[PDB]
Amino acid sequence: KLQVEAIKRGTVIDHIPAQIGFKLLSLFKLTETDQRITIGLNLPSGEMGRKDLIKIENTFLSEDQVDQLALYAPQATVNRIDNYEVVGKSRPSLPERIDNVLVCPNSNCISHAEPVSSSFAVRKRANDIALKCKYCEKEFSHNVVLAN
Amino acid sequence: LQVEAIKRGTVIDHIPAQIGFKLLSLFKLTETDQRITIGLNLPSGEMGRKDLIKIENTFLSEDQVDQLALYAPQATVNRIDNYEVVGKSRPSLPERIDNVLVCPNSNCISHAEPVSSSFAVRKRANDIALKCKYCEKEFSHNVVLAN
Amino acid sequence: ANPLYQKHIISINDLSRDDLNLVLATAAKLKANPQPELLKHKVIASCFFEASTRTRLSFETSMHRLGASVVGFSDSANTSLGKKGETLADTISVISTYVDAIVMRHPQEGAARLATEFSGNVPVLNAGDGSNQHPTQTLLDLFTIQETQGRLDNLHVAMVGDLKYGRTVHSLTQALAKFDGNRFYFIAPDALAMPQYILDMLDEKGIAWSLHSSIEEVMAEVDILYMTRVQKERLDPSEYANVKAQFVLRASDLHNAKANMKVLHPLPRVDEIATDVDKTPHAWYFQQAGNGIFARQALLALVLNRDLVL
Amino acid sequence: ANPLYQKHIISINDLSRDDLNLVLATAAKLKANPQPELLKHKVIASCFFEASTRTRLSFETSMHRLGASVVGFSDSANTSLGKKGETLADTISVISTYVDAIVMRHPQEGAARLATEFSGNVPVLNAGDGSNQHPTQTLLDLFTIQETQGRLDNLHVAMVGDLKYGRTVHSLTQALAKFDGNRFYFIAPDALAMPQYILDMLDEKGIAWSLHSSIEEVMAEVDILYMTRVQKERLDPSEYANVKAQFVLRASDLHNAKANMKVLHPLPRVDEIATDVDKTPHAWYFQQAGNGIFARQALLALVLNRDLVL
Amino acid sequence: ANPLYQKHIISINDLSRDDLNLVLATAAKLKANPQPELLKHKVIASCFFEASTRTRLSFETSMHRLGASVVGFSDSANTSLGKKGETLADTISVISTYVDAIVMRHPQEGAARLATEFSGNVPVLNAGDGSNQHPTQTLLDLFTIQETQGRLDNLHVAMVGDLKYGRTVHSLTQALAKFDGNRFYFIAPDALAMPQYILDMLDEKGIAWSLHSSIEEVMAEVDILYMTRVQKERLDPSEYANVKAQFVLRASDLHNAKANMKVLHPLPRVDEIATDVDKTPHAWYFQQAGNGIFARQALLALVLNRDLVL
Amino acid sequence: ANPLYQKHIISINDLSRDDLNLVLATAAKLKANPQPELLKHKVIASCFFEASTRTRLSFETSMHRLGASVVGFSDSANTSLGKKGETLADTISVISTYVDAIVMRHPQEGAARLATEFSGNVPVLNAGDGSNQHPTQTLLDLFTIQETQGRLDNLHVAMVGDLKYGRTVHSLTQALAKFDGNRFYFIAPDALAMPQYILDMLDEKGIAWSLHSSIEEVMAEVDILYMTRVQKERLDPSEYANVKAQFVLRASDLHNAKANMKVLHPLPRVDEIATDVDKTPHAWYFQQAGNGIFARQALLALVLNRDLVL
Ligand SMILES: Nc1ccn([C@@H]2O[C@H](COP(=O)(O)OP(=O)(O)OP(=O)(O)O)[C@@H](O)[C@H]2O)c(=O)n1
Ligand SMILES: Nc1ccn([C@@H]2O[C@H](COP(=O)(O)OP(=O)(O)OP(=O)(O)O)[C@@H](O)[C@H]2O)c(=O)n1
Ligand SMILES: O=c1ccn([C@@H]2O[C@H](COP(=O)(O)OP(=O)(O)OP(=O)(O)O)[C@@H](O)[C@H]2O)c(=O)[nH]1
């Protein structure tokens, strides 16, 4: 059945949008470990047609670590696994703040080329999500922040 | 098998630990619709541990294999079709490396400009030396890699 | 300790109605009863990474009126370190080992906030960070409204000029919207309209605001007429001359003004207020400037002193 | 009177081991027990003919911490008199009728020495004269070593970076060579090697020094790792990138460092020390900068006050 | 003689449709068969009171391609000396005794028109006067559209970017409005909309135009996509970043573009056209710049040579 | 066509010995019999992004001596405006639609090479790219040696001065190393020695070279004494003064010089050649500069004219 076999224990992030799995591995430094990791990209899915999938053994994510996925993989399923059984399923929910991973689109923001981590207050609108920079205090569409 | 066999495509085996993700990034291997399966930190009989990249319905040209040499010089590029390994190659040092490197010379024209980086390669005194196409300066590969 | 002791003063967004009232009460008190030795033996850094003579003179005077010593710089580019390679982070890490408080003005948004992350236990006061915040200007503006009007609630406030790029009008509107029953009149060319994000903020709090083509539309009702600079250098010279007429104030415009009405302007004024206004009892822009001393003293005292003796 | 009362402070070459110890003892004392009125009624000239914001802020803060008043200038070229025709001799002849001490930084070697010849009974303190001396930087460096190490003798001191053009490393080496049993490790590209005249000085005193290609060669033994700036603008951009790797410090380099080891840097640091070093207990460059206040206060107190009350 | 012989070329509003067609016909002919000695023994002044390397190089190359000699200057060199003591009138009164034609660019609107009043018999060609006119840019734009589309009537023209402050798009719109059946699509942020005096002009002539917030709205219908540069000045950094995605073109935006559609841009295109567009068959901004040579040759030939070039 | 027809001239390392001999042969011919109309109707761009009066005057004179027209600019004029918004790629993409060849000088290494990638059919001649290449200087140097010595093989060549940072001596050494039997003598202070990558190159080819601390060591054996300027920047004032006497030539140093020996210097020679050398038969630096005209004419003729000049 399975190209990427079941694991005894750790975390499986399922239901990741195509072209987003690699993004997650990169942005969240997921491969910076010695633990065994198995990945499937462009896998078929019933519920989404085509998906990415990341398994990380002997590793678990907190609730906000899962929530930090919300912006890139809102319908992801994070499965906790021990002794071969899914002992927990959770789903990302918009966090109150997003640190480190975003870049402020204000070219005059002090955040650029200074030894600080980016930080954004999160608030859902209606047809997007607004991101307000901790430093320059400007608020942007998530669609603007996420792009170039 | 944690990452099962494929019918047709390329399997890059024997990648050093912590080099598999770097290869995915540098060479944009995941910018495709084809099914990719990956193992990182897998046990290896000959290496202790390794990384592993499988790209279905996809084959690498000879110079594409050779671009791996600076990162995974002992890698094994296997071509697969109908579940059979039809070819094995090991990267050889290329004579030029384009696109992925960054010239360490801060005054090089390459930085502010719509051109691809390019370095001529010379394994010489058993060091690998990289000469920038633009500024014509030559650097140790260790200096070019850090930047 | 008082609620502002050892706090950073970075943004009007971080200050509550209670905070603003405390600063203003303290400013009235120091105005009435100066304490020239309050900050004796304190050394304060006056760091103008972006030069601003008037704000700097004002801030340094406030330091001296409380007895503190002052070290600092003002930077065109002419300054050693100075416009080049060292990070602001490192500059603050160093200076915060020297002094008891840092007052700083900088051309980049967020610069004062970044400074707080490296100043350890040394308080940072933002004297202006790019197009973001200038909280002491807002505090002096608020102090002036409160002193002349007797309150910060249920006011009719007109704002006139460049409402789009005026950081001081955005901050003042945000601050007044922390109080109840205020009503706003915005008078600006369409190219320089008060931004939608401010309007949405007002709408959410059920605060009334409306647009008007001229000052005479609302002169009868206004308590505070807050005039802003309109920098020609971001309008077409022809465009500016085409639109200036409705954002320029002369003494004759004040004929039906209420007895309590005050005209404010953060300065410099160039074209926007004719000099014949100066002698009217409504002119209050130089008094406003004067009040910067008391608002800035109050902030320094509260931040650097646990319990205000009075 | 103390041995430094009314003395000029021009060169580390003029200061004895006893002199250095006195300054350092006095700095520890003022650090522990400040004397904010010690120099009350003294006026000190802060004369930066060559601009240096960090040194000037440091020096002026020290003046204010002792209660002195400060007059001065900082000169790009923008300053009346100011870059042109009047001799430095005349400038000093005038200023020394105004003030009680002159702190001066100048782009020409020997400028502070020349000043002493025209300042009459007014003490001159050299805050940097071209590529020659910067004695207060050395004193703050020494104070920092002494405070963290408990001594100035029998130390293992590594110096890393531009050892050829660093006036601060030459002076520090000269000063430490006034003490006994110190051993030096010099880590620099061949183009920026510690000069032969310094090496000959060490050889004559039987002080051990050796060259090393990397910091890891000596990390296990080092007490003080003194990192210097390497100004790109005197290496080829290609040359710099070719050689920077062995003169750049990261937290990972500190794995086998002794518990007492401190990393120093006169600042600004740009490339030479990664920010991950900052949080290690070995990072001491901002503390070092902080110590400039106490070393500079000690110097001013000793020079301007006969008998240190303590 | 030909209709433009010895005429001044100051404003697109002084050139009739027949004049425009004549310049373009002459440009096509000189492109097909050069006349390298047509203006032999002519001396032309290239007077760039306001510097513009690209416009100046283009104009001077055109002079040389016709065999004329060139004298001139580029300015903004009274950087801190100040503005002229001597009037532009006097400068032109003198230069017009030297040369056979004057090509001039100047920071003030109307400068070329004033020049014609002092140049006597000598023709003045306007290479740009402030935010007023830039007729040869419009001529090269028109020539480029005519060449790639085969006509200047019944076209669907999109203009994108700073439509408010672009003298080049105002002129091109006025020029295309001299022809019949053209349809306009204006894509601009609200702050940078095509001015009303332009829309009124189109309305008087019964010419259809519409506003759009995005290029994709119109891509499938456009024959010409005329991009302009959004000046960072004209905006706040944060504002610019919020709007940018609208006025920026990348190759993927062209998927539904008509095969004949050409993308133009008067240059520099720094941000608004991604380099991936360059290799598409639609990219025509460098060819456009190239056509500046033939448009400017044509104008020089017609103004200075009595008989039509054939 | 001739081997250099329509070729880019970017680097000495791309020119073979045959190419070098061809340029020099062509230079000799044009010196003997000028061809003032060879490039009639050609337009050449003289693009000095980095200013260089002497190189630019030389190159433009060469263009005119062949009858070509010239358009261009000299820069470092974005003095405080800032670096380009527009890419060098775009500048070249535009200019290459104007002219028949581009001669360019630029402060960044690789700039001329990048230009070739955007210039299409238009040849690019490198007049200097940072510390990388300056091929026409090497060509004029070679032509001068060939003319005065009668050959480019079996020569004894001394190079003196800043051998470390002189792009001109690196190139001349690489060029002479394409010929046979040449012997090198490198006279330089330790801080400014000929780089190892050069010595390795000579070692691969079995070419003899030796280091000397003084010109007299080698004077009696040299055919060419190639002097370079020691940049005061590259050193400290005191260091420079300690070393100067080694790399400075005066007439008395030439007493034992061979009758055929010529002294060259790419200029300016400010310090290193005393004016008393000028009237000796060995002084050949002005004749050398003169030969720049013929070397640059030769290159322009070969690149732009299909057939060999005969
Ligand atoms: N020992 C295990 C158990 C399960 N999984 C993986 O974890 C994911 C969730 O397991 P499961 O709930 O059993 O699959 P589904 O029923 O499809 O769950 P969902 O509805 O979330 O898709 C699956 O991708 C499965 O392959 C695993 O890798 N190792
Ligand atoms: N249909 C197949 C066949 C092979 N492989 C993979 O390709 C690699 C090499 O194949 P193979 O020659 O069968 O394995 P080895 O004998 O171990 O070869 P080597 O000595 O190179 O390790 C292995 O990772 C194997 O799992 C695969 O993914 N799909
Ligand atoms: O752990 C896994 C899960 C899935 N897969 C591979 O992914 C594909 C789907 O296998 P699934 O098991 O995920 O089917 P599914 O219906 O549960 O999918 P969802 O709707 O929940 O998204 C199959 O091709 C399978 O081989 C793995 O290789 N490993």
Ligand SMILES: O=c1ccn([C@@H]2O[C@H](COP(=O)(O)OP(=O)(O)OP(=O)(O)O)[C@@H](O)[C@H]2O)c(=O)[nH]1
């Ligand atoms: O295609 C593969 C190959 C290997 N693996 C997994 O990697 C581990 C090694 O399996 P291998 O099959 O690669 O063993 P090996 O002896 O050939 O190792 P090398 O020296 O050739 O490197 C095993 O745990 C296996 O499950 C896969 O999951 N998929």
Ligand SMILES: [Mg+2]
């Ligand atoms: Mg499922």
Ligand SMILES: [Mg+2]
């Ligand atoms: Mg194997």
Ligand SMILES: [Zn+2]
């Ligand atoms: Zn920001």
Ligand SMILES: [Zn+2]
């Ligand atoms: Zn390079």
